[PDB]
Ligand binder design. Structure first.
Ligand SMILES: [Mg+2]
Lengths: 352, 104, 434
């Protein structure tokens, strides 16, 4: 009836799955080589028993802080508070979390939040993994990755959402392939496995990494997560049982199309079946790049941030880690500047 | 940028490929606009004249940037990006994990 | 300073009124090189293929905007950043970028234009002459010219089957005197044709195409002009032929049909009969070179002609070899011909042109750097002929600046060389006995 697969995911690079929220600069304190993210409710509760509600209001209502009235540690030190225990959680200081320094004026004015459930713990939603799997399957099938995937019957090209049949059709047997692939979500994997990586862009035309002011909360490298993929039909069962050897083919196409133009010391190596999860990995990892080439570039031709040729490579900075695999000692990256390929992960799928 | 400078070869390439004669102009939202509306917006203050234009593109994968030099106390030349720096690298993070079924 | 900084192609016209392209290369220090491409052919099984638009509304389908776009958007992005003196590396990179044996993707015209422009820009950067850059310090030999004077076949309505007739002033002491002798013979023949009532309007090479009775009549008029100028035929000035027998060869019947051009009274010859006719012509007249005496595929006939006449008469393979290293090597192995005609756009780059010239020299063959029907004001082939010390050139008649430009450049090279310049004449036919 149903075939249940276990997908073990090992992140080889930081993975960020946001929820639209952002820690502003007045929600975390950088001290003791750590980032403390206090709960503002408990913060207010213990500064109403200490009678500093009004100046906190003046600190947060304030619209244009100049350089230093924008940081919570400045408020904590100005009013002489040393009682830093109001719920929350701490992120250990990476080192490589940001250019400049985390002190001073610019530093980190915004931190993109990771997706968290109602209890405050992080998790990877099943719809993110399902979107990655759907991109892998659609990009490795000649009946889906062809010229019929674009809808030129309109003002601008757009994806043919009805190329893969879905939904109920009148007087017809159910023909929904992706209702059968039921990818579940993870379990809360604790707040100790998060870091504060920053987005860098590596241009092949310029040949140097350019940092950008876009800081994220991402899962640390070498994180083991487990997903359950329940399948009901034989077609989707064959597709999911071929998810490995399809991920390899998709990555081979991606490497021969995009990653080959960049220095081999930035591109990571694979231990298991490749996959790209979360934000910041790139547009080609989320598109049928065989068809989307030319259209996606033209979308950005009249903007200031012009997409030149096939674009830049997204290379975040996170500490180098070496895995003692039973073949030797495999370093995660091939460069000494600590450049991970943001959004990368590996997986192994079994049929438990 | 103080550790680096614009390379002479890239400057020459930009010079007689004449990329500065084919500037593109953008408004405050970064949308391409004609020079007339760019001038209009800059005059009325709705566009920042500094960060609102581009010098076309230089063809040929040339390196845009060279290292910048300075003088040491000996009176010798030295690259600005080399020196005492700091000393904090540890060794690595060996995470064992001698069970992962590595695909061939 | 020698880093290639800008590469730019533009569409110009050739000497026939047909489009071609020219490529300008600028390096960082300001060195400049301009390479102009002669008009070639877009067809051929084993020759380099030029790129043409095919739009009949523009220039009758002979526009070169596609090759210009290939240079400006493809080749320039790959060559900019190279060293201008890295000519072999640039040519190899362009050949690999094309990815096809016949260079049909980018176009052979584009590749040759970038090659010539890079070589000229490197010579400008080094402040050396082009021949010194191309061939080194030991460049001294001024080539013996084979000046087209009378043409027939497909270039004339006269009953003459041979395509071209040339004068070779190999007895001259210097190249300057050889050029003067050829100009004087050209004007003497013009006077003779005016006296005889024939047409004196030039064709594409600058040579007359008058209504003679036959090949023999043309050769006697040539000798009459040589003696009218005041030079001894067979000692001072020799005669060369370009039969182009691949045009009137019945491939199926394996017969050389002279009836295609010489009327119905002409004879139909076999390979052995063709060799007999060529030997009779060589015995009657002071003929020193014969080009395309057999079909481009008649390998045994080429062999037999080389065994019969190759000891005393230079035999040039134009369609036989089409500037191809493979065909030239096969001909060397089979003892077919003793000379090769080197057309730079038939192969596509200067590197492989010099490779073919070097292989032909190592085989004992002579290399004849040649023009095309549609030429330009560019005179790089003169610098190629001096640089390789080939000792023979074929750059047309004495009548148009698409032809006169190369002769003027050879005059400039001889003047610059001074006392080192050597004009060998008959000694430049090292493929012949004694
Ligand atoms: Mg010929």
């Amino acid at each position: 009836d149903y075939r249940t697969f276990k997908l073990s995911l090992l992140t080889l690079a930081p993975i960020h799955i946001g929820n639209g929220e952002k820690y502003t600069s007045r929600e975390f304190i950088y001290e003791n080589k750590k980032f403390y993210f206090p709960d503002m409710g408990k913060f207010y509760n213990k500064m109403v028993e200490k009678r500093l509600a009004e100046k906190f209001e003046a600190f947060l209502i304030q619209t244009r802080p100049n350089a230093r009235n924008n940081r919570l540690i400045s408020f904590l030190n100005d009013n002489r508070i040393a009682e830093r225990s109001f719920g929350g959680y701490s992120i250990s200081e990476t080192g490589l979390e940001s250019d400049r320094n985390p002190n001073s004026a610019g530093a980190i004015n915004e931190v993109n939040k990771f997706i968290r459930d109602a209890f405050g713990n992080p998790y990877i939603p099943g719809s993110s993994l399902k979107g990655a799997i759907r991109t892998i399957l659609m990009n490795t099938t000649p009946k889906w990755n062809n010229e019929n995937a674009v809808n030129d019957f309109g003002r601008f090209p757009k994806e043919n959402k009805n190329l893969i049949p879905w939904g109920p059709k009148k007087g017809k047997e159910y023909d929904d392939l992706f209702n059968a692939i039921r990818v579940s979500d993870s379990k809360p994997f604790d707040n100790k496995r998060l870091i504060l990586v920053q987005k860098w862009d590596y241009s092949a035309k310029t040949n140097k990494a350019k940092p950008l002011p876009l800081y994220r909360e991402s899962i640390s490298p070498l994180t083991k997560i487990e997903f359950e993929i329940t399948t009901t039909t034989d077609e989707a069962g064959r597709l999911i049982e071929e998810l490995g050897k399809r991920a390899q083919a998709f990555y081979k196409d991606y490497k021969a199309f995009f990653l080959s133009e960049f220095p081999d010391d930035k591109i990571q190596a694979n231990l298991q079946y490749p996959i790209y999860l979360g934000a910041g990995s790139g547009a080609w990892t989320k598109t049928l790049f065989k068809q989307a080439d030319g259209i996606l570039q033209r979308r950005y031709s009249r903007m200031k941030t012009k997409m030149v040729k096939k674009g830049v490579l997204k290379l975040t900075k996170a500490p180098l880690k070496i895995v003692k695999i039973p073949s030797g000692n495999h370093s995660l990256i091939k460069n000494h500047e600590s450049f991970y390929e943001m959004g990368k992960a590996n997986f192994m799928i079994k049929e438990i | 940028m103080k550790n680096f400078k614009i390379s002479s070869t890239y400057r020459a390439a930009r010079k007689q490929q004449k990329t500065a004669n084919r500037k593109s102009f953008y408004n405050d939202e970064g949308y391409m606009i004609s020079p007339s509306e760019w001038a209009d917006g800059v005059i009325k203050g709705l566009i920042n004249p500094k960060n609102s234009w581009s010098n076309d593109h230089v063809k040929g994968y040339l390196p845009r940037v060279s290292p910048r030099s300075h003088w040491t106390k000996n009176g010798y030349r030295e690259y600005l990006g080399i020196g005492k720096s700091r000393d904090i690298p540890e060794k690595e993070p060996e995470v064992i994990e001698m069970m992962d079924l590595e695909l061939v | 300073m020698s880093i290639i900084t800008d590469v730019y192609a533009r569409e110009v016209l050739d000497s026939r009124g047909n489009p071609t392209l020219e490529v300008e290369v600028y390096t960082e220090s300001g060195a400049f090189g301009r390479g102009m491409v002669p008009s070639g052919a877009s067809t051929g099984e084993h020759e380099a293929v030029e790129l043409r638009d095919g739009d009949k509304a523009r220039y009758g389908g002979l526009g070169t905007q596609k090759a210009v776009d290939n240079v400006n958007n493809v080749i320039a992005e790959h060559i900019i950043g190279f060293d201008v003196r890295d000519q072999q590396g640039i040519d190899r990179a362009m050949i690999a970028l094309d990815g096809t044996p016949n260079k049909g993707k980018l176009g052979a015209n584009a590749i040759l234009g970038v090659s010539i422009a890079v070589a000229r820009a490197a010579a400008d950067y080094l402040e050396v002459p082009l021949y010194s850059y191309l061939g080194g310090f030991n460049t001294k030999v001024l080539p013996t010219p084979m000046m087209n004077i009378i043409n027939g076949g497909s270039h004339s309505d006269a009953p003459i089957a041979f395509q071209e007739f040339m004068i070779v002033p190999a007895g001259a002491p210097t190249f300057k005197e050889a050029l003067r002798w050829g100009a004087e013979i050209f004007h003497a023949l013009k006077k003779i044709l005016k006296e005889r009532g024939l047409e004196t309007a030039v064709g594409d090479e600058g040579g007359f195409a008058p209504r003679f009775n036959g090949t023999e009549d043309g050769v006697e008029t040539i000798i009459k002009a040589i003696e009218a100028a005041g030079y001894v035929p067979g000692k001072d000035v020799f005669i060369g032929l370009d039969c182009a027998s691949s045009e009137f060869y019945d491939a199926e019947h394996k017969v050389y049909g002279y009836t295609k051009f010489e009327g119905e009274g002409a004879a139909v010859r076999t390979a052995a009969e063709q060799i007999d006719y060529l030997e009779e012509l060589v015995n009657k007249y002071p003929i020193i070179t014969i080009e395309d005496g057999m079909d481009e595929n008649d390998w045994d006939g080429w062999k037999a002609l080389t065994e019969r006449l190759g000891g005393k008469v230079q035999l040039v393979g134009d369609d036989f070899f089409v500037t191809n290293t493979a065909y030239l090597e096969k001909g060397i192995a089979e003892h077919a011909a003793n000379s090769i005609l080197i057309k730079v756009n038939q192969i596509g780059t200067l590197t492989e042109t010099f490779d073919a010239i070097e292989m032909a020299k190592e085989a004992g063959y002579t290399a004849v750097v040649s023009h095309r029907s549609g030429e330009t004001e560019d005179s790089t082939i003169a610098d190629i002929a001096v640089a390789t010390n080939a000792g023979q050139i074929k750059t047309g008649s004495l009548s148009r600046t698409d032809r006169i430009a190369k002769y003027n450049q050879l005059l400039r090279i001889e003047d610059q060389l001074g006392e080192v310049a050597e004009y060998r004449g008959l000694k430049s036919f090292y493929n012949l006995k004694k």
